[PDB]
Amino acid sequence: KYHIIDHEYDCVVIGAGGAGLRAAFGLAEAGYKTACISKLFPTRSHTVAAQGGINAALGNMHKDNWKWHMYDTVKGSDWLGDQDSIHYMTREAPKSIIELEHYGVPFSRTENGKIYQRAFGGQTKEYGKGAQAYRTCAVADRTGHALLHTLYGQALRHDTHFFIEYFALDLLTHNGEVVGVIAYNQEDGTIHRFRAHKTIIATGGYGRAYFSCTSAHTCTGDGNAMVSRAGFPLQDLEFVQFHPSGIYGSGCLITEGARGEGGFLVNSEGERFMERYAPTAKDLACRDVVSRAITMEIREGRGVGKKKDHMYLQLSHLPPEVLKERLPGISETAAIFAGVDVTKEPIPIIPTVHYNMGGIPTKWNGEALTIDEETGEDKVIPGLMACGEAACVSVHGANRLGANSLLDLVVFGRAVAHTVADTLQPGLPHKPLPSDLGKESIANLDKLRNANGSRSTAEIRMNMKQTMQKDVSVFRTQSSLDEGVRNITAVEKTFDDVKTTDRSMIWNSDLVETLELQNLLTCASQTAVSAANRKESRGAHAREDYPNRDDEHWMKHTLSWQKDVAAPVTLKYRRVIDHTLDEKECPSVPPTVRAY
Amino acid sequence: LPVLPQKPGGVRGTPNDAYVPPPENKLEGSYHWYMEKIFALSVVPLATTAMLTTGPLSTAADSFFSVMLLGYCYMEFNSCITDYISGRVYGVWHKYAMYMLGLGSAVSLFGIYKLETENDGVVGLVKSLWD
Amino acid sequence: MNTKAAIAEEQILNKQRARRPISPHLTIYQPQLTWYLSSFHRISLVLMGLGFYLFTILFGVSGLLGLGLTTEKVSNWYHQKFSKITEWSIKGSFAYLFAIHYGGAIRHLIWDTAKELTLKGVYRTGYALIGFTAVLGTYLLTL
Amino acid sequence: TPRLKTFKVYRWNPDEPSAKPHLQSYQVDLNDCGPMVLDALLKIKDEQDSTLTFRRSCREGICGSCAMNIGGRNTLACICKIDQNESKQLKIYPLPHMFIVKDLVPDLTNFYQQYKSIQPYLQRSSFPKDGTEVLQSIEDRKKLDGLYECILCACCSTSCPSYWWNQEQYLGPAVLMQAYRWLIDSRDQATKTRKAMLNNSMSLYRCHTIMNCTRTCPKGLNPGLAIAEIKKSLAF
Ligand SMILES: *Cc1cc2c(cc1C)nc1c(=O)[nH]c(=O)nc-1n2C[C@H](O)[C@H](O)[C@H](O)COP(=O)(O)OP(=O)(O)OC[C@H]1O[C@@H](n2cnc3c(N)ncnc32)[C@H](O)[C@@H]1O
Ligand SMILES: CCCCCCCC/C=C/CCCCCCCC(=O)OC[C@H](COP(=O)(O)OCCN)OC(=O)CCCCCCC/C=C/CCCCCCCC
Ligand SMILES: CON(C(=O)c1cn(C)nc1C(F)F)[C@@H](C)Cc1c(Cl)cc(Cl)cc1Cl
Ligand code: SF4
Ligand code: F3S
Ligand code: FES
């Protein structure tokens, strides 16, 4: 028997990354009483690994209006992004970086004393017909590193109650509304109950459901599985972005900023990727036209390798004074894990899982959505909000543009703090509920702790990662996808005989890594169902059997429901927004054929 | 020595409290850092012009050397008291060992008065037991 | 009186905080040249400081408790108690404990102006000290 | 032919606290492992004893969560290479002189309370008029290099003998470099209050310049030079 401890707040934020930290002192400054439950220390998250930039139209180099920035985001998304969150993110993009410089983010500076901006791929000028524009606004090659350590320091200026190393288990729902979250103290072994009015989820992606991913070790989907256990849908789970710059074996990442400054991929034959399997734009293109330019190139026997299945990216043409000033982080990362050289000899390259352009469906102001059972229209869940990588605002749509994911955290963490300030009065009585609230999520903690079966936790986790790499690949068809749904159901039925050796409550790291396996099977049994039910080729979802893009029948998102593991998955759809927040301020952009 | 009751495990509270610093007390802060460098810049040259000579030092020059060498040996034991006999653990037995260095360094100043007027000097004593 | 009942958290955590051990700090750390040469600097001044507070208090108490003690009478009492080894064990140990504190004091003068504080200069003004205690230390032993 | 090392891991178990902390030894097949120590600590947890507890997040060396004592020095366990030698062994310890929670997990609670006291945020008073950013020249930007790249791993604090004993009062070399990052920032109009919490007996002046911290920093920083630049700042 466990003893529960009760808390009582106004707004509970789950997660302390880049968009959970921005929405934590955004609400504790307005006059509320917040809490920021985290599993790690705040400057340990996955947003410390970001090394690109934050795209903004600040002006400091050449000339740039945010309306050019908006068209480059809709064109690089295959018109699946809602064209009013694009209008809202790029309009509040110059205002959100100047506010980040006043907090104390040490930016690289130019000759007159303004912020330094490099160039990335996809972003042009003069509405797609022009040159490469310089809008990246970046701090050498440690941009995500110097962004947490400023946002965490500013979060200590205002009184925010951080709850470090608390594993959150499930959501608390009474008659179809979220009234708080139940957590688990790792240092002590006590069960806590947080009660609030507006619960905000910023947990992050589910990248660790695959075999070779670039994500962290803790980067599992615990926000998308807490929502799916309550009976609420997830949106666009079949768009997974594959990176073309992942090291063999380990899965680590070299940035595409090296390709933005003159990185050239050299295959075994030494011929350049321009006309064989490549678009007219050489290397500064989307993240999917180059991964398809690599996945079939190593298959056709043109790449380097002992097993002929990798590449290398040349950085030797640059001057030595340009590497050691702009990218010192890659000069030490490829010297340890790859272990040949960075400057005089190139480094191996494999396609790895990078980013997830899906999750909880929200609006442009942060509040989550579901659909009505008979009319098919949207509906707002009362209390549940979401922001960051674990929320599908569809700013990225079908393909995330380069370095738009750090602008995603700053703008849509700032907007979450503003919409609670328009609805919630500071200081309100909480309704009396029964004391058995959350008793169905403590009995799951005890069933996975007193376990005795035939398979261990590290044996079932190898059958899931191996299955998701073979079948849900870069190239998919309707003969291996239907075997990928059939195999992922067979691994979930063997979760009833999982085995756990540690029977303590103080730092049971065998329990915590078993609850992360229960959350991964819920985000992996809906990716395989949704990917085998879209007969189309857009974005990062390329079907071999249906090689044509649809603008008449398949311009709609995909919602999915699944209660627990070993339970059937259903699907419904919702319509994509094609209008703007205001017609006179910016006109809408009509769909054309996408070609770079 | 007796030991004051300590914090249970090193810390008391949550990671979002703060360590409130003691106020500015410059006579053991930056001004104590001046006196440790004045005495250490005066025993380095004077010990060099006491190894190059060939006999007893001049009686006015030796008193300057033998009172700068007491400050260099008092400021050392002031740091071995503050590091090991702290006031967290022992309490009032930190300022009792500081008082023992009080009348153990003023009687040691009387010994320099009975060495430069009667005998030849401090460095004359060290040459006498040879080395 | 709902969140100020988090003092029921401090009464269960502080019973678990009393059974925690301390990890070993000495006897597992590897020997480096940073924390060895800085230990012989503080060992040198403690032993030579006790050899300065025990020869000056002796003349100070004789000035108040009247006995009379010339340096000749001290020398004839110190040269008779010991002989051979002891006099060549005190003389050989204290002569090397003075050269490592003389070269140590000049080393800490450079480090207090924020010079030679790179990792290259720490191992450069530390190798020139080890040879220095083997040259000037023996010259004080033939005198 | 399998090669076997012998990893010796410090072990404690809090629900049986009457037992004493001892070392347990495993035989890791060296062919089926990675080239790092973290890759040989996860293989023990899966195919062998699963009650081994430790912290790991990113396997890259930029998070600062695998801080332990491998071989005698303090380093990060995801970037330390294993000696390819099946004859010699290896001893894995936690950070020295910390209160140990379970196995290799210290209690870094005093370390987080000390980082909050140095006020790590910008304290400017009057911003620009038109609403743009704050001007800062390039030579004033170059002063910050080598100071903002710290990852807060506390491998330099738990190697200093002056911090081993007096850790409830002395801030340590990891915090005192972050008190220097805000002292030489050009856009900071509050510096007469930062040099008033270090002007007592034990916040800064327990540094005896026994430079272990610079020796065992796995990012190549200089936390010992940035303390002897504060002492010149308070004096002159
Ligand atoms: C992995 C990666 C991503 C990346 C990148 C390079 C790498 C290696 N480079 C980028 C770049 O150059 N430009 C760019 O625009 N984006 C780049 N990215 C992507 C980007 O970094 C991420 O998408 C983004 O930073 C994610 O941030 P978010 O705030 O969404 O999430 P997080 O940083 O992972 O933090 C989540 C926190 O949630 C807490 N948590 C998680 N689960 C729980 C549970 N169960 N209970 C309690 N708390 C929980 C964690 O503490 C975590 O800190
Ligand atoms: C055993 C003495 C007990 C009294 C003091 C306790 C020990 C203090 C240190 C004793 C060991 C080092 C001092 C003596 C070693 C020097 C060798 C020596 O004295 O032999 C006699 C020799 C005679 O030769 P000269 O004719 O003078 O030179 C001819 C020039 N060509 O004298 C000398 O070498 C020079 C005398 C050295 C005086 C140094 C003063 C020692 C007292 C130190 C107390 C604490 C000081 C701390 C360090 C000070 C420097 C930072
Ligand atoms: C690293 O050396 N040791 C220090 O403890 C130290 C040395 N310095 C310069 N500073 C410190 C720190 F404690 F402040 C210890 C290990 C040795 C030591 C001890 Cl245990 C006791 C004494 Cl009296 C002298 C000495 Cl040599
Ligand atoms: S300054 Fe160095 S030793 Fe200290 S936490 Fe940072 S990397 Fe570690
Ligand atoms: S080892 Fe310690 S004494 Fe100073 S030089 Fe480093 S903080
Ligand atoms: S685990 Fe991230 S640094 Fe070793």
From TrEMBL, chain C:
Its membrane topology: Multi-pass membrane protein
GO MF assignments: electron transfer activity; metal ion binding; quinone binding
Cellular compartments annotated: Mitochondrion inner membrane
UniProt keywords, alphabetically: Heme, Iron, Membrane, Metal-binding, Mitochondrion, Mitochondrion inner membrane, Quinone, Transit peptide, Transmembrane, Transmembrane helix
TM segment ranges: 43-67, 88-110, 122-141
Main location: mitochondrion
Presence of the UniProt keyword Membrane in the record: yes
Protein name (record): Sdh3p
Species: Saccharomyces cerevisiae (strain JAY291) (Baker's yeast)
